């Protein structure tokens, strides 16, 4: 496949695009060998975790221990592009699509697993903590979309009840969402994909208005500067603090339950799926709120070990992001040759 060497030309290749383009190359050449089953199985989880540095190292080492089975110009070109790779929060399109797909799979997995009984049990934690202006939730939750309507209304607790928690945080003050009001722009793209970014035709959604948020770059130690791998949608989420208030009431009211980690995991995971699907936030814009130690304490002291959406297999979405990256980078080379053909008509 010479295609991989034409994709590697793109000036805008990022670390995500690399992992996806390198792994797809390796899996065609040396493929189905179950000896190598491990290597890709572990890279797929490393990409998900957003541990690109580690994966890059592994990927080049694969071509170090396995050079004989792979094409030399490709192995050496990958090695060359690698030292210079960067990630930019404003533009992380392969990962934007990946996570938008991942949260479809995370919604199916919550759907197979949950009977929605925790979302009915979590009603009375909501109604307990809500501000008086927040609307008492009286309905029974029989479908995942009512748990989803319900879950998301915790945003009403914002700016008020979540503040005592919000103040303990070292991370949140390093948020960098520009205070500019930019309004809403139209979009047909789903999730955390950007409106003007290319997409598959099976993957379009009904056109709607989507909010425009600007990054504040003048922030020292700003989050998009610390974790550039994470796509910017709205910086650090503070509605996580509100779910934290609601959830803390649940842990108290249900401390004796033996299925509490499973149930709290279902709630946490549906939140992640939901914020990604609605375009509110990226995964690490939520998880990176939850995992701050002081909040980890709430779970740990109650013996709740959260999986934060880590699923068994991320393959279908890994392979679909690979096709997208491929087709965009060949289109960049397609565009490059084209304009360099039109430069010669003078």
């Amino acid at each position: 496949e010479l295609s991989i060497s034409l994709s590697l030309d793109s000036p805008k290749l990022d670390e995500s695009d690399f992992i996806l383009l390198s792994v797809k190359y390796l899996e065609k050449s040396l493929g189905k060998k179950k000896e190598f089953s491990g290597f890709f199985e572990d890279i797929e989880k490393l990409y998900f975790k957003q541990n690109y540095k580690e994966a890059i190292e592994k990927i080049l080492d694969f071509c170090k221990k396995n050079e004989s089975l792979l094409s030399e110009q490709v192995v050496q070109r990958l090695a060359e592009v690698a030292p210079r790779l960067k990630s930019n929060p404003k533009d992380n399109e392969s990962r934007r699509l990946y996570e938008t797909l991942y949260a479809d799979h995370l919604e199916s997995v919550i759907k197979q697993e949950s009977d929605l009984s925790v979302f009915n049990e979590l009603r009375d934690s909501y109604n307990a903590v809500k501000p008086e202006y927040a609307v008492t939730h009286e309905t029974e939750i029989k479908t995942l979309d009512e748990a989803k309507q319900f879950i998301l209304s915790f945003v009403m607790l914002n700016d008020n009840v979540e503040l005592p928690l919000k103040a303990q945080s070292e991370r949140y003050p390093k948020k960098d969402r520009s205070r500019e009001e930019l309004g809403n722009t139209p979009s047909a793209n789903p999730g955390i994909m950007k409106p003007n970014s290319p997409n598959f035709t099976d993957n379009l959604v009904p056109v709607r208005d989507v909010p425009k948020i600007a990054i504040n770059e003048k922030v020292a130690g700003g989050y998009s500067k610390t974790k550039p791998t994470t796509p910017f949608v709205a910086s650090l989420s503070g509605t996580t603090y509100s779910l934290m208030v609601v959830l803390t009431d649940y842990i108290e009211k249900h401390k004796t339950d033996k299925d509490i980690e499973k149930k709290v995991n279902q709630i946490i995971n549906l939140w992640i799926s939901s914020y990604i699907k609605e375009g509110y936030h990226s995964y690490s814009e939520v998880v990176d709120v939850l995992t701050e130690p002081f909040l980890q304490s709430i779970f740990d002291k109650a013996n709740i070990k959260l999986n934060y959406g880590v699923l068994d297999d991320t393959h279908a979405e890994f392979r679909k992001a690979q096709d997208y990256v491929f087709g965009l980078t060949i289109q960049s080379a397609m565009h490059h040759e084209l304009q360099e053909r039109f430069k010669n008509k003078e």
Binding site: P131, Y133, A134, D159, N160, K175, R179
Partner: protein
């Protein structure tokens, strides 16, 4: 007509309005009386954040009705 905008302090702002006044309009009056930037303003009625492009007639917001104000906070 009339309305009362309550704060998280429980203090009561009284803003005289006419039912076609937009939510954009009421936040401006609020700033004029209290100085609060209109962009930190979130007005709730019947449990729903009021969109500033609609009107009080569109929310069935009427005379002697109370709205809730919650100031947004982005310092970090």
């Amino acid at each position: 007509m009339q309305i009362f905008v309550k704060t998280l302090t429980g203090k009561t702002i009284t803003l005289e309005v006419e039912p076609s006044d937009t939510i954009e309009n009421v936040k401006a009056k609020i700033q004029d009386k209290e100085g609060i930037p209109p962009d930190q303003q979130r007005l709730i009625f019947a449990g729903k954040q009021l969109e500033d492009g609609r009107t009080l007639s569109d929310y069935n917001i009427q005379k002697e009705s109370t709205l809730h104000l919650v100031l947004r906070l982005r310092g970090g």
